Amino acid sequence: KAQIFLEGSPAPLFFSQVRDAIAYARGPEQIAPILVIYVNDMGAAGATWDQPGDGNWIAADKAFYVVGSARRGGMGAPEAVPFSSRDEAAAFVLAEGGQVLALADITDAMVLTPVETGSEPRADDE
């Protein structure tokens, strides 16, 4: 599950779909900036809307994110798997995943490719 708390706004935006709410936090937020986002670490795998089940509650903005290069959206709607444990996010990359970065370190280049043209994601970093 995902929920974002906006700065200045006394109300948090909660959604079952982590990927959906975290997407909102990256743009559609609207009127007020995101102060902190809390997610129920579950996921695995998905984090699908369906989710894996329950989980742990963590601050996603202060957590590890894995952007899947092998399976994700890429061309479509990319989904971010936010985890409290880095090694879990890394394990996701071990199977498929892509890059493990923090919410504070989320770059668009990793989540979506313009043309690919090659540019380095963050810095060739990751």
Curated annotation (Swiss-Prot):
**What would be an example GO MF term here?**
metal ion binding
* Places the protein is found: Cell membrane
Is Membrane given among the entry's keywords?
yes
Question: Assembly and partners?
Answer: Monomer. Apo-NosL can form homodimers.
Q: Recite the UniProt keywords alphabetically.
A: Cell membrane, Chaperone, Copper, Lipoprotein, Membrane, Metal-binding, Palmitate, Signal
Membrane topology, record value: Lipid-anchor
The answer on whether this UniProt entry bears the keyword Signal reads yes
- For this entry, the protein name equals Copper-binding lipoprotein NosL
A GO CC term attached to the entry: plasma membrane
Q: Which family does it belong to?
A: Belongs to the NosL family.
This molecule's function is given as: May act as a metallochaperone involved in nitrous oxide reductase assembly. Specifically binds Cu(+).
The scientific name of the source species is Achromobacter cycloclastes
Superkingdom of origin organism: Bacteria
